[PDB]
mmCIF file of C-alpha atoms in Angstrom:
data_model
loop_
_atom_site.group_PDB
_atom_site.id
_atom_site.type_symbol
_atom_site.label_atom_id
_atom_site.label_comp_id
_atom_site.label_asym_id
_atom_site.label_seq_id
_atom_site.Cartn_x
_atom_site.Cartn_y
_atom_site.Cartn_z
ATOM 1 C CA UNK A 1 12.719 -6.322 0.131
ATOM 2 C CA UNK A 2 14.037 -5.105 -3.015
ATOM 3 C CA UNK A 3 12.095 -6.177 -6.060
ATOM 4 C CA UNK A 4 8.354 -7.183 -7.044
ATOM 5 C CA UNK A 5 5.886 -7.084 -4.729
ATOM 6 C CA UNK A 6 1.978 -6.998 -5.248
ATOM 7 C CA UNK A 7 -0.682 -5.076 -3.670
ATOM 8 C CA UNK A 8 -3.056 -7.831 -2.251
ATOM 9 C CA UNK A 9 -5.408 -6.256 -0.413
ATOM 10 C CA UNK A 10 -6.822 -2.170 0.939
ATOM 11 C CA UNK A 11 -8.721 -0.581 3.307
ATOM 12 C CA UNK A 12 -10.874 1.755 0.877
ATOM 13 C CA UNK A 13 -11.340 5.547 1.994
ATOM 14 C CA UNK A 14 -14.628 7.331 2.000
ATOM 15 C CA UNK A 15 -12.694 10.609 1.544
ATOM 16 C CA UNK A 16 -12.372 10.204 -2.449
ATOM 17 C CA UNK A 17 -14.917 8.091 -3.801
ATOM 18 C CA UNK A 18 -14.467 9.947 -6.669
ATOM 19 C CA UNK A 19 -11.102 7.888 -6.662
ATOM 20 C CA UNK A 20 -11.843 4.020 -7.956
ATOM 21 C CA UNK A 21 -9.410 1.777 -7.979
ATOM 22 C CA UNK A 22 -10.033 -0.775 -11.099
ATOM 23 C CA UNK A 23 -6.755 -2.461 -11.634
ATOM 24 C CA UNK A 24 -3.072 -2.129 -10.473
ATOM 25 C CA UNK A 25 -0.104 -3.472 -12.084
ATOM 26 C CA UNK A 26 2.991 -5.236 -10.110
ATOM 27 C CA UNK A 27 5.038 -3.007 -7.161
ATOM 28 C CA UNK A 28 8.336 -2.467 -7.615
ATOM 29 C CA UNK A 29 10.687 -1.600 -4.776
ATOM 30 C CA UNK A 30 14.392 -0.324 -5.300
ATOM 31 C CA UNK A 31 16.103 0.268 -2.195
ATOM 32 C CA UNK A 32 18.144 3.460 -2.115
ATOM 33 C CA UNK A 33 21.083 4.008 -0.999
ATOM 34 C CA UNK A 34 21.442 5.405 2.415
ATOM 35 C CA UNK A 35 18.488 3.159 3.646
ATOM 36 C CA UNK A 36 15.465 4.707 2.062
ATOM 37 C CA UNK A 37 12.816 2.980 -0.114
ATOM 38 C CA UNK A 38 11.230 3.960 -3.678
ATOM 39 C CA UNK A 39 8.030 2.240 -4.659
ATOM 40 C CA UNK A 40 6.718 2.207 -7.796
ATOM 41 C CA UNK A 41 3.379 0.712 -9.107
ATOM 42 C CA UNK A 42 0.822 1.911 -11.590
ATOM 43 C CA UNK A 43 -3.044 2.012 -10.775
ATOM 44 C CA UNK A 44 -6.112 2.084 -13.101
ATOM 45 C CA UNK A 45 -8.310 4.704 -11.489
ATOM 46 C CA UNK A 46 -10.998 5.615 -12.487
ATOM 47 C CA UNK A 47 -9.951 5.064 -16.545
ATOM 48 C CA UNK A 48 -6.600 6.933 -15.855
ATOM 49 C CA UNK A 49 -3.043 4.885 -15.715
ATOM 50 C CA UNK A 50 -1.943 6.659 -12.804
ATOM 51 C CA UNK A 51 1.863 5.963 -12.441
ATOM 52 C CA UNK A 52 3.037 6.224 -8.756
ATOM 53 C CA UNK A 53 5.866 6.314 -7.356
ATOM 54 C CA UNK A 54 6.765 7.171 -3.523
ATOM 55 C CA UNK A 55 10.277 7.710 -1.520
ATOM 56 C CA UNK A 56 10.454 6.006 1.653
ATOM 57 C CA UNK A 57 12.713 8.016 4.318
ATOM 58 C CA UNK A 58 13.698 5.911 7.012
ATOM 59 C CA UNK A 59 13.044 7.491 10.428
ATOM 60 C CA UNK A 60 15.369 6.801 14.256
ATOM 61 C CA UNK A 61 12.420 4.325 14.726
ATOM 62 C CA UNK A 62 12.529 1.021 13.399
ATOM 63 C CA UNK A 63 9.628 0.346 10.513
ATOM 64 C CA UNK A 64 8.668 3.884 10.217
ATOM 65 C CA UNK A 65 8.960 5.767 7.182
ATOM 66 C CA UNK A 66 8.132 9.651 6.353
ATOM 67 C CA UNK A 67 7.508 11.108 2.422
ATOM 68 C CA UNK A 68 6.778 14.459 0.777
ATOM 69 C CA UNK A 69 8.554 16.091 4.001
ATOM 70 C CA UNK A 70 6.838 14.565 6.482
ATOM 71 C CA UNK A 71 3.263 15.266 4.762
ATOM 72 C CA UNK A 72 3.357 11.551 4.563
ATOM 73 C CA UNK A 73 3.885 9.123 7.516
ATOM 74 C CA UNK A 74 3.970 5.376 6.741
ATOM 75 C CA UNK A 75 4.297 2.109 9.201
ATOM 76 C CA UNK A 76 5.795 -1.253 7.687
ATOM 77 C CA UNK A 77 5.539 -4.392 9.432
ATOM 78 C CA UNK A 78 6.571 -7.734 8.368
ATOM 79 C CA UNK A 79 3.410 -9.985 8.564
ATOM 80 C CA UNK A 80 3.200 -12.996 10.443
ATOM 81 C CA UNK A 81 2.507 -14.829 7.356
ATOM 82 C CA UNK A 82 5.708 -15.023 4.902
ATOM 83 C CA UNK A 83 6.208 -13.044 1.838
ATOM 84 C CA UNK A 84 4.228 -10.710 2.877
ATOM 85 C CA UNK A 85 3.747 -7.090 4.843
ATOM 86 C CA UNK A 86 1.190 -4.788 6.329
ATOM 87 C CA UNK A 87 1.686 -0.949 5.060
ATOM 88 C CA UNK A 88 0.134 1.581 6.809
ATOM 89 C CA UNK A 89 -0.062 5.159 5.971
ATOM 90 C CA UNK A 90 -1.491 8.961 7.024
ATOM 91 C CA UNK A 91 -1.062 11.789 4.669
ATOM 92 C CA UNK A 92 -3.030 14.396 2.871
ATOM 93 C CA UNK A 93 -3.954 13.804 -0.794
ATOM 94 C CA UNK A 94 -5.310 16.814 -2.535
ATOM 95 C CA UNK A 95 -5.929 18.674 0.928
ATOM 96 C CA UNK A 96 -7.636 15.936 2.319
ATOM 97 C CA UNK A 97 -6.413 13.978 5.069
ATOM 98 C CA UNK A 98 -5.778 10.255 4.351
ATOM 99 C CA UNK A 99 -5.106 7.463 5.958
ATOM 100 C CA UNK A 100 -5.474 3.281 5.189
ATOM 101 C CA UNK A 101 -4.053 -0.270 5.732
ATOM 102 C CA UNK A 102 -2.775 -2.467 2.231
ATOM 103 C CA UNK A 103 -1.380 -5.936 2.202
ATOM 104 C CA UNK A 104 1.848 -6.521 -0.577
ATOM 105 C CA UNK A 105 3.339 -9.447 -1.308
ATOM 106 C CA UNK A 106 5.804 -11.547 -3.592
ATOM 107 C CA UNK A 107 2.860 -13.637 -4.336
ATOM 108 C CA UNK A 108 -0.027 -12.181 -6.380
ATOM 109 C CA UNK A 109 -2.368 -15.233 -5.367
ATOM 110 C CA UNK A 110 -4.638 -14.352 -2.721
ATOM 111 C CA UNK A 111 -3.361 -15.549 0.727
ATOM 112 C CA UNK A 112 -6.065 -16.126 3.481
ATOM 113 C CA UNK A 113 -4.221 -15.899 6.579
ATOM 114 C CA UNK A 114 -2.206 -12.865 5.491
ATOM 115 C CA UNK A 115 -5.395 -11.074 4.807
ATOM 116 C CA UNK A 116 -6.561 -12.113 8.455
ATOM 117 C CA UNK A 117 -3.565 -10.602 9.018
ATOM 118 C CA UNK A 118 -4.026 -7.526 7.569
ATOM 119 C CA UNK A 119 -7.451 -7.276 9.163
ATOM 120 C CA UNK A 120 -6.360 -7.430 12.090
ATOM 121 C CA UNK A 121 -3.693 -4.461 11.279
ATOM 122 C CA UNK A 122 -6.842 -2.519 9.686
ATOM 123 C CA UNK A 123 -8.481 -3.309 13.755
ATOM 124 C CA UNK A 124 -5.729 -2.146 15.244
ATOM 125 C CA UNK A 125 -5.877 1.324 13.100
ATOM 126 C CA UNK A 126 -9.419 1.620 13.543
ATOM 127 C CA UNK A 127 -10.580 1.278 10.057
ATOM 128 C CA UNK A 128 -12.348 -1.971 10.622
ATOM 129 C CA UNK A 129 -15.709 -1.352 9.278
ATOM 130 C CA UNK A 130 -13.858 0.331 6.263
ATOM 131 C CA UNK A 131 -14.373 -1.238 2.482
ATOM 132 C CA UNK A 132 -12.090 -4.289 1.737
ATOM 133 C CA UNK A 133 -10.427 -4.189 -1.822
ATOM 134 C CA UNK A 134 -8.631 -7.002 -3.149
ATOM 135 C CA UNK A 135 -7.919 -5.179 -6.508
ATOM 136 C CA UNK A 136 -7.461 -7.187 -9.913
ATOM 137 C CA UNK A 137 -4.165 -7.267 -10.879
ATOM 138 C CA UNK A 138 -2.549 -6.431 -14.587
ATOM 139 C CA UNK A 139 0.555 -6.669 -16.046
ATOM 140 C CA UNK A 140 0.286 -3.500 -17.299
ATOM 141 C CA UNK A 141 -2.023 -0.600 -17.764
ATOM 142 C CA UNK A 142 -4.603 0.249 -20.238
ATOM 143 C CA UNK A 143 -8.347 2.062 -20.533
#
């Protein structure tokens, strides 16, 4: 899975609507060694280039991923449609607790039945009646 990928699509949180997402710029994931992940992406919020950038520690279970010592639990599964994978995530950003579904994938184009995919993932959380984001993408950042 190393490479670019592209957030597609996320569930958006009530928690921080101080926190607007306006653009986000392509995903890159570098596969560590020892069988961890590191993503990196930047994301126009708000008029700030945020730059982040996230360690992936693989877990004894299959899919399931921990960051920030465990503050940070994430679930990747492949989606039925190809190119493409459902991320979910619970954690605490700035105290708060945090949780949501997002859709990547090699293809920036907007997919239909991967995001009828990932609805069904955002279901199966229980964020269904959540805010749908299918964010603008950039090539890079800028105010």
């Amino acid at each position: 899975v190393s490479g670019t990928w592209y957030l597609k699509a996320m569930t958006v949180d009530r928690e921080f609507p101080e926190m607007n997402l306006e653009s986000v710029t392509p995903m890159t994931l570098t596969t560590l060694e020892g069988g961890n992940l590191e993503a990196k992406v930047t994301m126009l919020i708000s008029g700030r280039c945020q730059e982040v950038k996230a360690v992936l520690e693989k877990t004894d279970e299959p899919g399931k991923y921990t960051a920030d010592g465990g503050k940070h639990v994430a679930y990747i599964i492949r989606s039925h449609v190809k190119d493409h994978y459902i991320f979910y995530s619970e954690g605490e950003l700035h105290g708060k607790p945090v949780r949501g579904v997002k859709l990547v994938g090699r293809d920036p184009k907007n997919n239909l039945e991967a995001l009828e995919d990932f609805e069904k993932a955002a279901g199966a959380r229980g964020l269904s009646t959540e805010s749908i984001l299918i964010p603008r993408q950039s090539e890079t950042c800028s105010p």
